[PDB]
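FAQ
Q: What does a multi-component entry look like?
A: The components come first, one per line:
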Amino acid sequence: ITRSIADQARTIRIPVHMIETINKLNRISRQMLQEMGREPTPEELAERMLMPEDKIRKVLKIAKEPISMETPIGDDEDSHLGDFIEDT
DNA sequence: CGCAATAAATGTGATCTAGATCACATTTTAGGCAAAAAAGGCTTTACACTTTATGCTTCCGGCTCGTATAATCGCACCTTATGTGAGCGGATAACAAG
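Then the predicted structure of the entire assembly, as tokens:
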């Protein structure tokens, strides 16, 4: 059961380490918060990890749902999320 | 031929320009022909294009395996309480026929 939901979980394919890299930076964020009491700035963790600081920000942009289309916005009658995007 | 009356036609003659002359010497004009500066011509050589075989290396990328671990279990507390009528099948009670 940990093999099937290990890849084909979301509606779209998702890598393995891409979801294992999130909780990796989690069990350390509160680790420095329970001691010092301040938010771990992207400077001290840049020396303990293999990620610089710039490219690591674009990684979070990938980790999403992202979002459906047939979802009410304002009119809640005929207006849909995928009905406001112009065509090229 | 004499008479009517709105338009067109008439004279004046001194003043002041407008338009024309002449023969010869000066000044302008036209197209002409090379030279210089420019257009594309049609060569022959200097270099530069991505492409694609390849294989070797380090770094970032993407995927799994087994292991170690405890469990196969437990309260008290916070705040609400959809709307209806119309259409439908099923279960139950009252009824006439045998």
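Q: Is there any commentary attached?
A: Sometimes. For this entry: The helical segments of chain A are 17-20, 55-62.
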